[PDB]
Structure 1
Amino acid sequence: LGLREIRVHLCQRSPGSQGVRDFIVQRYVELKKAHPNLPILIRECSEVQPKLWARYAFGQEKTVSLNNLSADEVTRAMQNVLSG
């Protein structure tokens, strides 16, 4: 149940990744301040769907598609992943 890893896959140029890009620009830094032991791996590619992976203990992974989600509900999805 304990969170081990957060992976954010986005695009450098896509309408669906615009909110994810905005979230990483304005809010990733203090997220890393709040959790400076958790790997939030930011991976960006040309033609990938905006996707969020939460790896918990013993290899379980929860997958959240955040295609065409703007910054504030991307933030609340991240908060729901961090809390539960």
Structure 2
Amino acid sequence: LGLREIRVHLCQRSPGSQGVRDFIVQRYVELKKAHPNLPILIRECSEVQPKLWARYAFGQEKTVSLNNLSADEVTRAMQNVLSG
């Protein structure tokens, strides 16, 4: 099944969000140029867990928590959430 809304929750000063912050720093742009129609929301909050709330269809909201996850792990998580 397809995907409708990606939703990345960040923390800006927590050290467990450094990989997903670096992923948004260096390769968010070609992800948007690959998928411009579906929104990938980036919301930021201090002292919160890093999250990957994905909304597919009919209210299906699947959650991935990515505390202490690096750049290769968060791009693997984005790849298997884009695949299904």
Same fold (TM over 0.5): yes
Q: Which residue of 1 aligns with 2:50?
A: 50
Q: How big is the alpha-carbon RMSD for the aligned residues of Structure 1 and Structure 2?
A: 0.7
Please give the TM-score of this superposition, normalised by the length of structure 1: 0.96
Which structure shows the higher strand fraction? 1
Residue 64 of structure 1 deviates from its aligned partner by: 0.4
Residue 51 of structure 1 deviates from its aligned partner by: 0.7
- Structure 2 stretches lacking a partner, 5+ long: none
Equivalent residue runs for 1:18-57 within 5 Å: 18-57=18-57
Aligned equivalents of 1:10, 1:68: Cα separation in 2: 12
Residue 30 of structure 1 deviates from its aligned partner by: 0.3
- Structure 1 stretches lacking a partner, 5+ long: none
Aligned equivalents of 1:68, 1:55: Cα separation in 2: 23
SS of structure 2 residue aligned to 1:68: coil
Residue 37 of structure 1 deviates from its aligned partner by: 0.5
Equivalent residue runs for 1:1-84 within 5 Å: 1-84=1-84
Residue 2 of structure 1 deviates from its aligned partner by: 2.1
Aligned equivalents of 2:77, 2:16: Cα separation in 1: 15
Q: Number of aligned residue pairs: give it.
A: 84
SS of structure 2 residue aligned to 1:59: coil
1:22-52 superposed Cα distances (whole Å, 9 cap, x missing partner): 0001110000000010110001110110111
SS of structure 1 residue aligned to 2:9: strand
1:10-31 superposed Cα distances (whole Å, 9 cap, x missing partner): 1111111111100001110000
